[PDB]
Amino acid sequence: CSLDQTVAPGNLTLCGNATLFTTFRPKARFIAPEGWMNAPMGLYQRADGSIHAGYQSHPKHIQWGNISQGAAYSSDFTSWTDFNGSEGYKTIWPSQIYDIRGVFDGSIIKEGIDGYPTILYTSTSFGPLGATLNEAEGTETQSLAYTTDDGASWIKLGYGAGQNPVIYEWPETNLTGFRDPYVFQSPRLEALLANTTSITNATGDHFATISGGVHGDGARLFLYRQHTTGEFIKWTYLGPLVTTGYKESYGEWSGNYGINFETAGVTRLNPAGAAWDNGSDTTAVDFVTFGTEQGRADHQNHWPLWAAVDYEVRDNGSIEAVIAYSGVQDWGRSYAYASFPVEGYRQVSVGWIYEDDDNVILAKQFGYQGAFTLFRDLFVKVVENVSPSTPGLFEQASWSTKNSTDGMSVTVTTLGQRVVPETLAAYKGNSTVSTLAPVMLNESAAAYTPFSSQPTDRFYALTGSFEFGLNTTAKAGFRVLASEEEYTDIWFDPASENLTVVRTASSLIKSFGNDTELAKVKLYEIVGAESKTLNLTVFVDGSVIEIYANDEVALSTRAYPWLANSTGAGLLADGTTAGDVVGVSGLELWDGLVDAWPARPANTSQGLVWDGPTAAMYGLFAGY
Amino acid sequence: CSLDQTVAPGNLTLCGNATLFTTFRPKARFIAPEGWMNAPMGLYQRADGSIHAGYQSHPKHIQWGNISQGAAYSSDFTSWTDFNGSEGYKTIWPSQIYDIRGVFDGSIIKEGIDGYPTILYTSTSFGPLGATLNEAEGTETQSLAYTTDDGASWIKLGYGAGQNPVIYEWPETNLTGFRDPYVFQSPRLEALLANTTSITNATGDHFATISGGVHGDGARLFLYRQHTTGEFIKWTYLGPLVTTGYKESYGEWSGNYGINFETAGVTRLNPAGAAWDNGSDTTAVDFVTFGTEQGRADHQNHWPLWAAVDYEVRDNGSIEAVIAYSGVQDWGRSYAYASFPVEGYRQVSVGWIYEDDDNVILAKQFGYQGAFTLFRDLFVKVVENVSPSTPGLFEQASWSTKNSTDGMSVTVTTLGQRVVPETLAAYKGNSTVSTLAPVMLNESAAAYTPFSSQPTDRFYALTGSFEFGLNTTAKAGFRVLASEEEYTDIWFDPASENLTVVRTASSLIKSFGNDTELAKVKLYEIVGAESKTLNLTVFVDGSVIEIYANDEVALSTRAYPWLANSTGAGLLADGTTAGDVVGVSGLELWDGLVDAWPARPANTSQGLVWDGPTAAMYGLFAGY
Numbered sequence A, B: 001c002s003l004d005q006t007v008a009p010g011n012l013t014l015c016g017n018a019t020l021f022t023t024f025r026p027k028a029r030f031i032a033p034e035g036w037m038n039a040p041m042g043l044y045q046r047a048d049g050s051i052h053a054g055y056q057s058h059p060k061h062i063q064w065g066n067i068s069q070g071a072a073y074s075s076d077f078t079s080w081t082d083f084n085g086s087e088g089y090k091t092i093w094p095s096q097i098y099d100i101r102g103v104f105d106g107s108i109i110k111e112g113i114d115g116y117p118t119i120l121y122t123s124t125s126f127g128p129l130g131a132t133l134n135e136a137e138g139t140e141t142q143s144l145a146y147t148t149d150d151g152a153s154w155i156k157l158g159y160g161a162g163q164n165p166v167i168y169e170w171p172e173t174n175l176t177g178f179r180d181p182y183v184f185q186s187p188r189l190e191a192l193l194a195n196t197t198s199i200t201n202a203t204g205d206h207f208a209t210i211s212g213g214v215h216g217d218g219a220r221l222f223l224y225r226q227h228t229t230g231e232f233i234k235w236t237y238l239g240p241l242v243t244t245g246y247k248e249s250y251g252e253w254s255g256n257y258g259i260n261f262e263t264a265g266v267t268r269l270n271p272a273g274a275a276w277d278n279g280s281d282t283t284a285v286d287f288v289t290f291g292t293e294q295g296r297a298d299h300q301n302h303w304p305l306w307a308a309v310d311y312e313v314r315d316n317g318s319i320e321a322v323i324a325y326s327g328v329q330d331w332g333r334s335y336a337y338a339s340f341p342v343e344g345y346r347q348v349s350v351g352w353i354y355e356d357d358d359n360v361i362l363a364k365q366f367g368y369q370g371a372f373t374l375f376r377d378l379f380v381k382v383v384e385n386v387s388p389s390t391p392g393l394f395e396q397a398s399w400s401t402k403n404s405t406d407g408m409s410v411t412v413t414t415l416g417q418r419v420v421p422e423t424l425a426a427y428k429g430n431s432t433v434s435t436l437a438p439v440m441l442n443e444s445a446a447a448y449t450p451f452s453s454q455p456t457d458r459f460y461a462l463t464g465s466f467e468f469g470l471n472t473t474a475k476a477g478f479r480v481l482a483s484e485e486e487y488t489d490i491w492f493d494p495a496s497e498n499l500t501v502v503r504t505a506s507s508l509i510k511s512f513g514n515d516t517e518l519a520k521v522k523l524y525e526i527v528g529a530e531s532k533t534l535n536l537t538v539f540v541d542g543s544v545i546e547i548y549a550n551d552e553v554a555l556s557t558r559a560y561p562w563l564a565n566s567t568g569a570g571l572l573a574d575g576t577t578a579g580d581v582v583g584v585s586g587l588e589l590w591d592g593l594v595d596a597w598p599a600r601p602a603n604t605s606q607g608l609v610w611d612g613p614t615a616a617m618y619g620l621f622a623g624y
């Protein structure tokens, strides 16, 4: 095992555990100290204003198992501190018959048991568990725990009748899944149900969704309501909130609804952020965010989706969320998005970016797997004065259109996502910032043009505004993590409406994924404009490449170049001519970003362990 | 629910939980504070000389489940003190994937991990578990924990490779069971194996048996040897120590070997007690004690047995224990005998006495189930100068015979059991003792003759020596827990060699068991004697009736008379005549015994709880 990054990579599978720990590792984002992580969980803003973030965690392993809540906190979403207790950075772990198979995703009741922050989580026990298996009632249940020390530790309710687990009966037969309770308050849903509470007797101020589906018949999001205000044991099933078909797709802009939902949440937004009105705010829109499984040929069979919904009240005192339009939260290697309320009328969303080593070839050598996305403010994106000749505009696929009275312009509404401003400000202020001169891409443009200032390592951000002709067939974008021999190309092709990440040359190491990422991006053309513009922001953080377009489209992916000098960046141009020109402006490079875990040393590995021969006997966890 | 014990019992199933807590409850013996108990476990004499006793425990329930180690200590086997920690009187409980289904029986390595007392116990996980089910490897494994505070708490080794569980591979396929590790030192077995240690490389000073069997092919006791002295992770399977046939019986004196062993142990004894020689003591005998299941039509399908064995060394460096003779440790409602070494060359044995309410009709009303037997010194019982005309003597069923050189007398050898002297001394000294005049039972004897002094409650002991003619057909014994309407009759019938406990009138409450208990007792006739003698000792302790004959035969049973005055006792006589006379002498009543738990109040119930609907979903525990 040579770690010489000035020459071609050897056989890196001969390298020891965690010998590649720092080589590809993000430094500017949320990530576990070591080992396996997946979904964000237990997210809440604490009483002191700081953010608590939990995550599915398996320390000292590089595959999933004994799944626990790891946790940390931050005052600005950006610089984090690990909790440290008797179980290291874990704060909830399998410990009881009802959750011994895994402490799965959960969400926070801010004023819960005895007034304390309280988590409702999926407690798993033995038996087949999965949407493609024959799962039985009891394998996935929902349980409570509360914290008296602001998330340093959690106390579970006792096991038994009238205690944990608090939700165990399947609301319908033959479920594909029954997990990921999302607890939320909703003046909107309270107002809608107020005339029917005699039918169900459920009058509490908290709702909870549980994610699942029905074998052979598509995904389901089940709605529960807290039976009585101030009491947290009894939750009453109202009915299915979202019902989709077996591998149903709303189309090219909307992924696929698969066979089962995971990590679903419910929110209400307006142009400024979170909306807490009862329906009276005409600018507010109800949204569901949700993962789906088995509706995708790649990306671990997982789509992270969202839908705008219109609520209807059923005669039995339940709610049907009718999908109005449907989109994708991130088009790349991310999943398990969670959202949570933040002071100042905000709803903040964060997901999990998995590695691109699906055959587990170099995972042990890493000594870790996974990171978070950046934290994102959700809001209703409104585009005014949109031209009716915008191609495909009235398909209204992942957006809505409202015509002006005279029919000559359109207002477009969709889900907006932008990186939280605290992170952008901290990144910029800690970086060496190069404001770059605008670049006109025409007949003289090379395929690749390095920026006039270059990054110094694998931790940087780029921004640019690409102005295209309305009938362009030119392509342009950014190349990142680039040397002569390794590079990753981010292209936008307005003619096809496709944003791609080409990774055929991303790394000399051949075991990592190299498939082309793809997102659809609608450039809403503005009335009177003779051009259309793509604002593209790119974060490069170790191996993470996280792309944002127009405060709307997100695409997270991975690149693992071996060579030490595969850190360069610049502009890409294809088919730019004297006549078909691409004007690039607002160009800026931020080199360095922020050290997100300042108390951690560079190498936080504690080694890796094997569960031994019993792992295969129990059949629950891979064991490593 | 009336608790009026001066009139006939009502419908006691209407009574609330623990309303009958004190009514039938033993006071003079080891018993949990409340709830369910079964097998003794984790028995050892601590460094300060006191006795640690563990037991299988399920607090606040009256059926088995979440099985844990409850514990207490005593300086004299007789007066006990509960441990009190974060889990009450529990000291080990299900907490890890490998033992979440139950912390089953285990035994003590006195100088174990880091020099501390260490328990090797059966750690159970999910899956079918039982001799009549299709159990799979991994469901029962063996794990270690150690104590740094003399049994107040135990620290388990970590889960994983080279740690817990330490024994997990089945030594043969298709096991009926794989549990109850019994760890012991044996100069005898070390000497026998010393010439073969190159074959196995196992050279440690601790052995361990594991109890089980093979489907369709009878019970097995598997022998392991610690691989290396001072190291406790690696245990090497040598081979089967005891192999018996599917429902094989050695005969009328020996119960039945069933299909699977439980709670088996290995010891070596001589006439004084425990023997720790290498084979050089010609008075010493090797013994195995073991429970069997599914070889009995009643008594919960459980025989608590013992066998004298002769060890042979196999060519592969293992030991075959060849059964020389085979007996019964207790003939009544007891099981799960454990034995442990005690200072002064002693081996002390104690078992579990179950209730006689197999349909669980009044268990909730009790608020508890189960007690221990008394603690018993084991030794080799030797009877000298036995007459060769003793009927059935040369069948040598649960004893051995050695003829004198001249053939006119026999030395009989068998397993001896007697109540530990500390308990007899404490009982006697705390009781009101009545030494009774001898009673000749002849033609004038009534069926029942009350003693001249009577007990004052349900806590007393009786002794008597019954001298019978060599050709008697008379029966005699003791009646206990007696009023006019309720009584329990203990008869010996020398002609049939049967000791019986007739319980047809034991209680007016009809839901308790009323079947006749039966033990075989051999009166070894002495050369020159014109009579044969039965020394009978009886302990009455709440509902327990525990009978000892001749420091050899034990029979534990239950009687639950309702009436407050069903406490009397006296002599029984049947077929005594002028010619066929029974001389009773050495008669003594001890009224009161000892308060075995002086710190406990009379009612230590904490109420009972239900596990809720998930108990049936998990399918592991009854739930109550």
Ligand SMILES: *[C@@H]1O[C@H](CO)[C@@H](O[C@@H]2O[C@H](CO)[C@@H](O[C@@H]3O[C@H](CO[C@H]4O[C@H](CO[C@H]5O[C@H](CO)[C@@H](O)[C@H](O)[C@@H]5O[C@H]5O[C@H](CO)[C@@H](O)[C@H](O)[C@@H]5O)[C@@H](O)[C@H](O[C@H]5O[C@H](CO)[C@@H](O)[C@H](O)[C@@H]5O)[C@@H]4O)[C@@H](O)[C@H](O[C@H]4O[C@H](CO)[C@@H](O)[C@H](O)[C@@H]4O[C@H]4O[C@H](CO)[C@@H](O)[C@H](O)[C@@H]4O[C@H]4O[C@H](CO)[C@@H](O)[C@H](O)[C@@H]4O)[C@@H]3O)[C@H](O)[C@H]2NC(C)=O)[C@H](O)[C@H]1NC(C)=O
Binding pocket: A092, A093, A095, A096, A097, A113, A114, A154, A155, A156, A157, A158, A159, B066, B068, B085, B086, B087, B090, B093, B094, B095
């Ligand atoms: C199989 O068997 C298993 C083992 O028995 C069993 O698991 C156990 O289940 C029981 C029953 O559910 C659990 O007991 C509960 O414990 C809760 C506290 O849990 C936390 O703290 C304990 C104890 O912590 C001490 O000890 C540890 C270990 O040494 C130390 O680390 C601590 O620092 C602390 O040490 C101090 O105290 C010790 C004595 O206790 C001293 O010895 C020591 O010197 C120190 O001074 C921990 O062990 C727990 O850890 C475990 O669990 C966590 C998850 O929670 C895991 O992460 C971890 O790994 C461990 O597994 C944990 O940290 C109690 O709060 C709870 O008590 C209440 O509930 C019951 C039932 O409702 C009531 O009877 C009782 O009154 C309590 O309720 C009152 O209080 C709460 C909160 O204040 C109120 O909300 C409630 O309304 C009520 O209020 C009442 O009083 C008020 C007056 O003040 C009044 O206003 C109200 O009106 C009202 O009247 C309960 O005791 C036990 O934790 C489990 N143990 C383990 C190891 O798992 C398992 O379930 C079984 N399985 C099956 C299938 O049956």
Ligand SMILES: *[C@@H]1O[C@H](CO)[C@@H](O[C@@H]2O[C@H](CO)[C@@H](O[C@@H]3O[C@H](CO[C@H]4O[C@H](CO[C@H]5O[C@H](CO)[C@@H](O)[C@H](O)[C@@H]5O[C@H]5O[C@H](CO)[C@@H](O)[C@H](O)[C@@H]5O)[C@@H](O)[C@H](O[C@H]5O[C@H](CO)[C@@H](O)[C@H](O)[C@@H]5O)[C@@H]4O)[C@@H](O)[C@H](O[C@H]4O[C@H](CO)[C@@H](O)[C@H](O)[C@@H]4O[C@H]4O[C@H](CO)[C@@H](O)[C@H](O)[C@@H]4O[C@H]4O[C@H](CO)[C@@H](O)[C@H](O)[C@@H]4O)[C@@H]3O)[C@H](O)[C@H]2NC(C)=O)[C@H](O)[C@H]1NC(C)=O
Binding pocket: A066, A068, A085, A086, A087, A090, A093, A094, A095, B092, B093, B095, B096, B097, B113, B114, B154, B155, B156, B157, B158, B159
């Ligand atoms: C799923 O996830 C689960 C959760 O992660 C996981 O379970 C956990 O597994 C880990 C790994 O096996 C366990 O970690 C071990 O813990 C042992 C100690 O366990 C006891 O103590 C802990 C901690 O106690 C503190 O905290 C509690 C809770 O708050 C308090 O109640 C205590 O009072 C105490 O509090 C103080 O300390 C805190 C900080 O720790 C402070 O915050 C606090 O303020 C106080 O000051 C308890 O939690 C345990 O309780 C649990 O387990 C018991 C059963 O054991 C249950 O009954 C109970 O309900 C709980 O479930 C328990 O009481 C450690 O000893 C052990 O440490 C060693 O082993 C590793 C690996 O070999 C070594 O790396 C390490 O060095 C240690 O070994 C050394 O020391 C031992 C003994 O001294 C030596 O024998 C050994 O040779 C070695 O010596 C070395 O150093 C010497 C120098 O001194 C030198 O001479 C030698 O040569 C050598 O170099 C390990 O940390 C953890 O307990 C589990 N937790 C739970 C909750 O279950 C589970 O397995 C996962 N499942 C799967 C399937 O993966």
Ligand SMILES: *[C@@H]1O[C@H](CO)[C@@H](O[C@@H]2O[C@H](CO)[C@@H](O[C@@H]3O[C@H](CO[C@H]4O[C@H](CO)[C@@H](O)[C@H](O[C@H]5O[C@H](CO)[C@@H](O)[C@H](O)[C@@H]5O)[C@@H]4O)[C@@H](O)[C@H](O[C@H]4O[C@H](CO)[C@@H](O)[C@H](O)[C@@H]4O[C@@H]4O[C@H](CO)[C@@H](O)[C@H](O)[C@@H]4O)[C@@H]3O)[C@H](O)[C@H]2NC(C)=O)[C@H](O)[C@H]1NC(C)=O
Binding pocket: A161, A162, B017, B364, B607, B608, B609, B610, B612, B613, B622, B624
């Ligand atoms: C005295 O001690 C007990 C603990 O032993 C304690 O708790 C009670 O425990 C008993 C069991 O001993 C429980 O009985 C079961 O109840 C089930 C139905 O329960 C529902 O209705 C009840 C009556 O209105 C409610 O009280 C229950 O509420 C509690 O539980 C819910 C969770 O569901 C919780 O949200 C609440 O807060 C409460 O805690 C609940 O709504 C029965 O289904 C169950 O069924 C059987 O048992 C009977 C007796 O054997 C049979 O007659 C039935 O046919 C059936 O059993 C069958 O046979 C076997 C059973 O193993 C099986 O093979 C068959 O399929 C079939 O099941 C049972 O009756 C009782 O619910 C529970 N009460 C509680 C928790 O309040 C007491 O509280 C304690 N008393 C005091 C004063 O402290």
Ligand SMILES: *[C@@H]1O[C@H](CO)[C@@H](O[C@@H]2O[C@H](CO)[C@@H](O[C@@H]3O[C@H](CO[C@H]4O[C@H](CO)[C@@H](O)[C@H](O[C@H]5O[C@H](CO)[C@@H](O)[C@H](O)[C@@H]5O)[C@@H]4O)[C@@H](O)[C@H](O[C@H]4O[C@H](CO)[C@@H](O)[C@H](O)[C@@H]4O[C@@H]4O[C@H](CO)[C@@H](O)[C@H](O)[C@@H]4O)[C@@H]3O)[C@H](O)[C@H]2NC(C)=O)[C@H](O)[C@H]1NC(C)=O
Binding pocket: A017, A364, A607, A608, A609, A610, A612, A613, A622, A624, B161, B162
């Ligand atoms: C680096 O980090 C690892 C943790 O990841 C850590 O521990 C090692 O972990 C690996 C797994 O990553 C273990 O590999 C397995 O080993 C099994 C055989 O193990 C036996 O032989 C070893 C070699 O001599 C010994 O080291 C082992 O001793 C340990 O464990 C025993 C308990 O058994 C214990 O008493 C000792 O004290 C030691 O702790 C042991 O005697 C293999 O069976 C297992 O099998 C597969 O994996 C391969 C790679 O994928 C495949 O090539 C095989 O075909 C096979 O996998 C197949 O595919 C899948 C697997 O999921 C399945 O469907 C098929 O049926 C089939 O199984 C595997 O190779 C390794 O044993 C373990 N080492 C330990 C604990 O020492 C390292 O220690 C750490 N390094 C450092 C320096 O810290």
Ligand SMILES: *[C@@H]1O[C@H](CO)[C@@H](O)[C@H](O)[C@H]1NC(C)=O
Binding pocket: A005, A006, A007, A483, A484, A485, A563, A565
């Ligand atoms: C980068 O490193 C490679 C290999 O060490 C070398 O070919 C070249 O000089 C360096 N710069 C490039 C390719 O831009």
Ligand SMILES: *[C@@H]1O[C@H](CO)[C@@H](O)[C@H](O)[C@H]1NC(C)=O
Binding pocket: A016, A017, A018, A019, A020, A021, A022, A603, A604, A605, A606, A607
């Ligand atoms: C990181 O630390 C681990 C654990 O000490 C060690 O095994 C590994 O070699 C280290 N890796 C590097 C690259 O420093």
Ligand SMILES: *[C@@H]1O[C@H](CO)[C@@H](O)[C@H](O)[C@H]1NC(C)=O
Binding pocket: A237, A238, A239, A240, A314, A316, A318
């Ligand atoms: C309410 O009605 C809907 C639509 O028929 C149904 O799916 C749901 O199960 C009902 N809710 C109940 C039975 O609680």
Ligand SMILES: *[C@@H]1O[C@H](CO)[C@@H](O)[C@H](O)[C@H]1NC(C)=O
Binding pocket: A191, A278, A279, A280
């Ligand atoms: C919703 O709120 C508006 C004003 O904020 C109020 O007029 C209306 O009555 C509310 N709707 C309900 C609660 O029915």
Ligand SMILES: *[C@@H]1O[C@H](CO)[C@@H](O)[C@H](O)[C@H]1NC(C)=O
Binding pocket: A388, A403, A407, A408
């Ligand atoms: C919206 O505007 C377009 C273009 O003017 C027109 O084709 C369409 O019919 C309009 N829709 C409505 C509902 O008026």
Ligand SMILES: *[C@@H]1O[C@H](CO)[C@@H](O)[C@H](O)[C@H]1NC(C)=O
Binding pocket: A076, A078, A079, A425, A426, A427, A428, A429, A430, A594
């Ligand atoms: C650098 O980052 C830290 C941590 O996020 C932040 O608090 C600080 O404001 C940043 N420095 C600047 C903007 O100069």
Ligand SMILES: *[C@@H]1O[C@H](CO)[C@@H](O)[C@H](O)[C@H]1NC(C)=O
Binding pocket: A439, A440, A441, A442, A443, A444, A445
């Ligand atoms: C074509 O592009 C080059 C490089 O940006 C620029 O110098 C030149 O002025 C452009 N041509 C025109 C006609 O703008």
Ligand SMILES: *[C@@H]1O[C@H](CO)[C@@H](O)[C@H](O)[C@H]1NC(C)=O
Binding pocket: A252, A493, A496, A497, A498, A518, A520
């Ligand atoms: C653009 O993307 C779609 C998938 O949404 C694909 O079918 C089409 O071939 C792509 N076209 C080009 C030119 O990249």
Ligand SMILES: *[C@@H]1O[C@H](CO)[C@@H](O)[C@H](O)[C@H]1NC(C)=O
Binding pocket: B005, B006, B007, B483, B484, B485, B563, B565
């Ligand atoms: C015992 O009590 C019963 C019922 O109260 C009564 O018949 C009798 O007087 C008492 N004594 C007996 C039967 O020896």
Ligand SMILES: *[C@@H]1O[C@H](CO)[C@@H](O)[C@H](O)[C@H]1NC(C)=O
Binding pocket: B016, B017, B018, B019, B020, B021, B022, B603, B604, B605, B606, B607
């Ligand atoms: C014993 O105590 C328990 C728990 O407090 C109580 O429910 C029960 O009625 C008591 N029984 C008696 C006979 O005192």
Ligand SMILES: *[C@@H]1O[C@H](CO)[C@@H](O)[C@H](O)[C@H]1NC(C)=O
Binding pocket: B237, B238, B239, B240, B314, B316, B318
């Ligand atoms: C040793 O031999 C006996 C008798 O054949 C056998 O039962 C046992 O399994 C053997 N021990 C092994 C294979 O370790």
Ligand SMILES: *[C@@H]1O[C@H](CO)[C@@H](O)[C@H](O)[C@H]1NC(C)=O
Binding pocket: B191, B278, B279, B280
């Ligand atoms: C057993 O012990 C005796 C004396 O106690 C000794 O003579 C003999 O050599 C020992 N047997 C062994 C260890 O082979």
